[PDB]
């Protein structure tokens, strides 16, 4: 018996904010920790822990875009850092990069967690093109620096949102969204993990899908009826919100669960979409649970890398 030990950890304000959503949302079996500048902000935090870095630097304000201060107060609090993630087997950064909290402290708070041998997940916003040039080009660098920290990166343009509104969706909404990628691809570890499958998989198989692999895709697919299969796996690879679409992975974590009526004919049709969509030789990690509450659902978790 080997229960992982998952962390979810949110670095300035964006991603406080979403580790604040992913709280009230209820994830349990997840200890989730809030790192800020921003004491204001932090006081606010619905998180269990909660680390204020950089004091001395900023006087309990943010870091006023400024990555440099954001890095500079993650290190001189790196022993609280620490202390914070121990024990952890998996760790999930969430920031947005461009300002100057998330930008400098996330890929010290990775680099950190992946020094201490946890499995160091990164789930970063870029910033809007309304923002400007600067910010795009201040969270480039956030990014490669995240990139050389993490063992799998997630990264969420903001631009996509807009792709995904109407002239009227309120901006919190479109936040909602974004906040999914991250939320299902930590319940779909957690249920992994959780459960023993027909087939099963377990935090090894995402051990060696993950670990030291550069860019991911995480993503979760329900369908029902006719063609339930087929539709589960492509709503599982086809976020409009990614940067790292499916195209062009070569290793693929993923389970199907259903109840007593999961078919192995509809099993191969959901591996062949994943593996279609990639359009290259996958290695399939594939697994099975049989939930006999579920009726006509189906359920598709996909973790891809190998880019
Ligand atoms: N999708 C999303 N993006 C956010 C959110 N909050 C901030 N951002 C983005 O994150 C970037 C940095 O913001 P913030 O985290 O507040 O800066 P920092 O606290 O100084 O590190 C901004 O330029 C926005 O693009 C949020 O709640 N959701
Ligand atoms: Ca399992």
């Given at each position: 018996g080997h229960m992982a030990t998952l962390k979810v950890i949110g670095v300035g304000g964006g991603g406080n904010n979403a580790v604040n959503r992913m709280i009230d949302h209820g994830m349990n079996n997840v200890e989730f920790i809030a790192i800020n500048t921003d004491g204001q902000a932090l006081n606010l935090s619905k998180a269990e822990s909660k680390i204020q870095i950089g004091e001395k630097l900023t006087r309990g304000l943010?870091?006023?875009?400024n990555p440099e201060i954001g890095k500079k107060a993650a290190e001189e609090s790196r022993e609280q850092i620490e202390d914070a993630i121990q024990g952890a087997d998996m760790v999930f950064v969430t920031s947005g990069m461009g300002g100057g909290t998330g930008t400098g402290a996330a890929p010290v708070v990775a680099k950190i967690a992946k020094e201490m041998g946890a499995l160091t997940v990164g789930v970063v916003t870029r910033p809007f093109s309304f923002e400007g040039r600067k910010r795009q080009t201040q969270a480039a660098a956030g990014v490669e620096a995240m990139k050389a920290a993490v063992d799998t990166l997630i990264v969420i343009?903001?631009?996509?949102?807009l792709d995904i509104?109407?002239?009227?969706?309120p901006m919190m909404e479109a936040f909602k969204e974004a906040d999914n990628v991250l939320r299902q691809g930590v319940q779909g570890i957690s249920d992994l993990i959780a459960v023993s499958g027909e087939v099963n998989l377990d935090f090894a198989d995402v051990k060696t899908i993950?670990?030291?692999?550069?860019s991911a895709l995480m993503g979760i697919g329900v369908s029902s009826g006719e063609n339930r299969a087929v539709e589960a796996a492509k709503k599982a690879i086809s976020?409009?919100?990614?940067?790292?679409?499916?195209?062009?992975?070569?290793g693929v974590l993923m389970n199907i669960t259903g109840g007593e009526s999961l078919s192995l004919f509809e099993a191969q049709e959901a591996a062949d979409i994943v593996q279609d969509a990639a359009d290259e030789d996958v290695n399939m990690i594939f697994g099975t649970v049989i939930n006999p509450?579920?009726?006509?659902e189906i359920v598709v978790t996909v973790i891809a890398t190998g880019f």
């Open positions: 943010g870091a006023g875009a343009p903001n631009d996509r949102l509104v109407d002239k009227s969706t993950m670990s030291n692999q550069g976020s409009p919100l990614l940067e790292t679409s499916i195209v062009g992975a070569q509450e579920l009726q006509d």
